[PDB]
Design a protein around this ligand. Structure first.
Ligand code: GCP
Ligand code: MET
Ligand code: MG
Ligand code: ZN
Lengths: 470, 267, 143, 25
RNA sequence: AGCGCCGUGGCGCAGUGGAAGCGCGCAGGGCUCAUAACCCUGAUGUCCUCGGAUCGAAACCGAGCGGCGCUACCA
């Protein structure tokens, strides 16, 4: 005689709920798998890659259950520009009597510590092995900088391929090669379309996929047939994620930083502004233990041009009002997870795609903006993403002086001009600010066929720093 | 009952412009009634009617509806009008419909009053409408000023004070016009703290609201802040919003950010 | 919806919507002239008056209010084919056959097809009545 | 008929064929 | 999520404080030996759903429905 809502509240209470994070715990002892961290933040970032019009977000909603907005009326159907964020909790069940493959269970961010076992007849409770975040990268030919930024923030990969379509999909190859560029060898291949398939056709496509991945960097990548609409083979992907992907080294010794990819103004309309909030920047902490009430500055920040034409950068200092992660407001942030840093920053500053690929540093560190940067570049033999109708995939030409090139350092989408080209190094001038922290893997893309085309990889070697104006 | 011609006297003057509703055609044209001046009948000869070719007589006469009218000759000894539909132009038609509405509204209000009181409506125009049209040039504008100013009814002698009360109530109910002035300002700040600056500026903006004019700084976006006020006279709202603009600029010129205006105060 | 041509069957190319006709007494009002006009970068009067040129009957044109009346009994096929003659003679360029070419006047009054992809100045058939029609009303500036 | 207009039409067709030559040469 | 616009007889505009408006539609009739042009006469409708104001509200207002033009993805 109980409502579903009263029920859910009951088994949420019986599951231990969602405990509040402590104000000040012992950080020298915390691991990304402490029960304190896993319940209220994601420690592993997983990205999704695939061909256009494939349904990457559909697999994400099958796994977690949180939608990816898909906004802007026009972009409600075709393609979205920003990333796709959803939170999944990997619940294993402690009873070994039930079969291992259906033990694993992925649930939304709102799930409890120990909710009951949905399998009929099993009295076990789920234990949360890890909370993970999901980034749905774009899948189109024009949007490339956001994809590469997502790959840079990615820690694990999920490749999606459809079966009955043509076997050599070049968008998938471009995604995998870009993931290879930014030091990611943890990829799980996913066969999206298996229901409308024959027994021999699936085997032939599997053979084709296995033949495809022989000469690339990634060798031992698993392949899983999942159904995005039928909502099955969900536990298999979760157990594969648990097994093959370990934790990249990210501890508390490394200095704190932030890399903002998305911005979120907080200006709830219609109500009086006497009750208002700040402005949220969606950024990832690849290194750093950030807490509530800390000083931070956006390194490239305010971009201005004087009467002489010189580019001036005013780093945007700001006091962190709040940090948003997982579901509840959290006191201290765990590196290895997208976080909304909600600060006293201006409402307009976070309005549009403005804080897309910028570098932010806490008070107590000085990242350097650079105006001219020396890069060490390497490049492939043929472009990926060009469907040649039976003729020798376009072979890439060597770079030329005075060429506009889209250079993605980390997450920043900058247009560099070539000053010098050499055998294995090059010199780039940035009309848009970029900053150099430590190593910061880079990707290079050219204008060859109308739209952007990835060519190779690069690393920052030298540069001409610009001292910020106080 | 409709009587007691809206204007002063019974017979139209020379070259006065009026509005006539078609009532009956024998052969010569529209010997019909007026709806702006007195309802006295007046000739409309067919050649005094058509600018285009006379193709559709019945589509053109349109019995039962008002139309433009220019008076050429008046019978001031037995009562007749020489009236035409040829000495008109479009810009003349504009003031024609203006006067049509102006007379219609006053006839409606005073017909309501005379119907409710059963007091002869000619006495209503005698006691009320004609003194207002003498003071202010037209009883419609006088009613509009009565809505704001009570003094218009002083020096005027009621046939009964309940007439004054009912007229006040009905003109307040039907002739209720206050215009909204809205402005749009872009916050373009790239600075460190603007949200608190926005708190200060918007508190200052809303404190300036007067008891009769509450300016409400509403949110519709992050850069675009909207500013709405109910101008009671439509002359102080512009300066109120200019004060708000000075406030916003003065607040943001110091914190380090930048703010700019898109839509100044407009009714 | 048409693929912007008649004897051309691709799956990828620039789009045009078909035009139709409703009856007035008799003269047919064509609903879909402004949209095709914007899809060909060519004002609606060129569409209507070209249709008339290949047709040979009285026509009425009013761009401010959407009442494009062309007189005659014309089944959908006939006017869509005359508009196909329009697009082939006017809209599409030479090399790639681009369904967006503008009509431009240089310092000489050489009315010319100008493209964007190939971008050539296709030697225009000034030997047509629509050439004089277009030269009468300069594009987007006298309409 | 109006041989006025027939002669003028012949002149115009000759003009058009001459200009087609002018472009073609 | 909020503000400015609208609510047709088959379509475009309009007055919205005396209660279904015209052009264009159409059925029919008139004219012509005949057709059109024209001339005319007629038929469709819940100015959106429900209230307040009023002798009366499609109409002045409102306690909302359906759809549009901006802010802009607004924790
Ligand atoms: N047959 C089939 N259709 C699917 C499957 N999953 C999703 N779809 C369909 O794909 C279509 C588009 O899904 P969507 O997620 O928006 O594509 P997208 O991946 O975001 C576009 P991009 O690849 O550029 O990022 C949907 O209509 C959905 O029904 C599937 O597993 N099988
Ligand atoms: C896309 S916003 C960044 C994620 C953050 N946890 C909020 O939600
Ligand atoms: Mg997405
Ligand atoms: Zn061309």
């Amino acid at each position: 005689g109980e409502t579903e809502e009263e029920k859910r509240k009951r088994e949420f209470e019986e599951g231990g709920g969602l405990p509040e994070q402590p104000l000040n715990p012992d950080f020298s002892k915390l691991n990304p798998l402490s029960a304190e961290i896993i319940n209220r933040q994601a420690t592993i970032n997983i990205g999704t890659i695939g061909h256009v019009a494939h349904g990457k977000s559909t697999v994400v909603r099958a796994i977690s259950g949180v939608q990816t907005v898909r906004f802007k009326d026009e972009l409600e159907r075709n393609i979205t520009i920003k990333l796709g964020y959803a939170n999944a909790k990997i619940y294993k069940c402690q009873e070994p009597t039930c079969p291992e493959p259906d033990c694993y269970r992925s649930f939304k961010s709102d799930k409890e510590i120990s909710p009951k076992c949905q399998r009929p007849g099993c009295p076990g409770r789920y234990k949360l092995v890890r909370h993970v975040s999901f980034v749905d990268c774009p899948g189109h030919d024009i949007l490339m900088s956001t994809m590469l930024s997502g790959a840079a923030v990615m820690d694990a990969a999920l490749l999606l391929i459809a079966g009955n379509e043509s076997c050599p999909q070049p968008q998938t190859s471009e995604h995998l090669a870009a993931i290879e560029i930014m030091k990611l060898k943890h990829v799980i291949i996913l066969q999206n379309k298996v229901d409308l398939m024959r027994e021999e056709s699936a085997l032939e496509h599997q053979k084709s996929i296995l033949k495809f991945i022989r000469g690339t960097i990634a060798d031992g990548a698993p392949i899983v047939p999942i159904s995005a609409q039928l909502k099955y083979n969900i536990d298999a992907v979760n157990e594969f994620i648990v097994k093959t992907i370990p934790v990249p080294p990210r501890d508390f010794m490394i200095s704190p930083r932030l890399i903002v990819i998305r911005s979120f103004d907080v200006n709830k309309p219609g109500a009086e502004i006497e009750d208002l909030k700040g402005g949220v920047a969606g950024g990832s902490i690849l290194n750093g233990v950030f807490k509530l009430g800390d000083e931070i500055e956006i390194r490239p920040g305010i971009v201005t041009k004087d009467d002489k034409g010189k580019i001036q950068c005013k780093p945007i200092f700001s006091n962190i009002v709040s940090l948003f992660a997982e579901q509840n407001d959290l006191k201290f942030a765990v590196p290895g997870g997208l976080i909304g840093v909600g600060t006293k920053v201006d409402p307009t500053l976070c309005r549009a795609d403005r804080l897309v690929g910028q570098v932010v540093g806490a008070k107590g560190h000085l990242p350097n903006i650079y105006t001219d940067i020396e890069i060490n570049y390497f490049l492939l033999r043929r472009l990926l993403g060009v469907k040649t109708d039976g003729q020798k995939q376009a072979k890439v030409r060597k770079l030329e002086p005075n060429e506009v090139l889209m250079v993605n350092i980390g997450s920043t989408a900058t247009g560099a001009r070539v000053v010098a080209v050499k055998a294995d190094m090059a010199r780039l001038q940035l009309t848009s600010p970029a900053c150099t922290e430590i190593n910061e893997k880079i990707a290079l893309s050219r204008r060859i066929e109308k739209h952007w085309r990835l060519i190779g990889w690069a690393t920052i070697k030298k540069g001409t720093t610009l001292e910020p104006i106080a | 009952t409709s009587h007691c011609r809206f204007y002063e006297n019974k017979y139209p003057e020379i070259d006065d412009i009026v509005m006539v509703n078609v009532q009956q055609i024998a052969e010569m044209g529209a010997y019909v009634k007026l709806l702006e001046y007195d309802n006295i009948e007046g000739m409309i000869l067919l050649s005094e009617l058509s600018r285009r070719r006379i193709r559709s007589i019945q589509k053109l006469i349109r019995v039962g509806k008002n139309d433009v009218a220019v008076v050429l000759r008046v019978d001031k000894e037995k009562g007749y009008i020489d009236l035409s539909k040829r000495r008109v132009s479009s810009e003349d038609i504009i003031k024609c419909e203006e006067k049509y509405q102006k007379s219609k509204t006053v006839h409606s209000i005073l017909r309501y009053c005379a119907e409710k009181f059963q007091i002869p409506l000619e006495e209503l125009y005698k006691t009320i409408a004609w003194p207002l049209s003498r003071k202010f040039g037209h009883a419609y504008e006088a009613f509009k000023l009565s809505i704001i100013d009570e003094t218009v009814w002083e020096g005027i002698e009621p046939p009964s004070k309940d007439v004054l009360d009912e007229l006040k109530n009905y003109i307040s109910k039907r002739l209720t016009p206050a215009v909204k002035i809205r402005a749009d300002v872009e916050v373009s700040c790239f600075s460190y703290e603007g949200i608190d600056a926005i708190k200060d500026a918007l508190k200052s903006a809303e404190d300036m609201s007067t008891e009769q004019m509450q300016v409400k700084v509403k949110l519709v976006a992050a850069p675009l802040y909207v500013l709405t006020t109910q101008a009671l006279d439509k002359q102080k709202g512009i300066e109120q919003l200019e004060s708000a603009i000075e406030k916003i600029t003065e607040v943001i010129t110091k914190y380090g950010g930048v703010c700019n205006i898109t839509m100044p105060p407009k009714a | 919806i048409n693929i912007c041509r008649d004897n051309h069957d691709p799956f990828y190319r620039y789009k045009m919507p078909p035009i139709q006709a409703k009856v007035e007494g008799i003269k047919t009002a064509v609903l879909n002239v402004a949209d095709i006009s914007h899809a060909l970068n060519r004002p609606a009067p060129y569409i209507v008056k070209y249709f008339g040129f290949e047709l040979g009957a009285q026509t009425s044109i009013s761009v401010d209010k959407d009442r494009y009346l062309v007189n005659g009994v014309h089944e959908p096929a006939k006017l869509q084919d005359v508009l196909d003659g329009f697009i082939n003679k006017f809209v599409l360029c030479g090399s790639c056959k681009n369904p967006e070419t503008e009509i431009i006047i240089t310092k000489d009054n050489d009315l010319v097809r100008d493209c964007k992809a190939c971008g050539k100045r296709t030697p225009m058939d000034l030997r047509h009545k629509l050439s004089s029609f277009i030269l009468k009303n300069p594009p987007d500036s006298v309409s | 008929m109006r041989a006025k207009w027939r002669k003028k039409r012949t002149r115009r067709l000759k003009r058009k064929r001459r200009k087609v030559r002018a472009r073609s040469k």
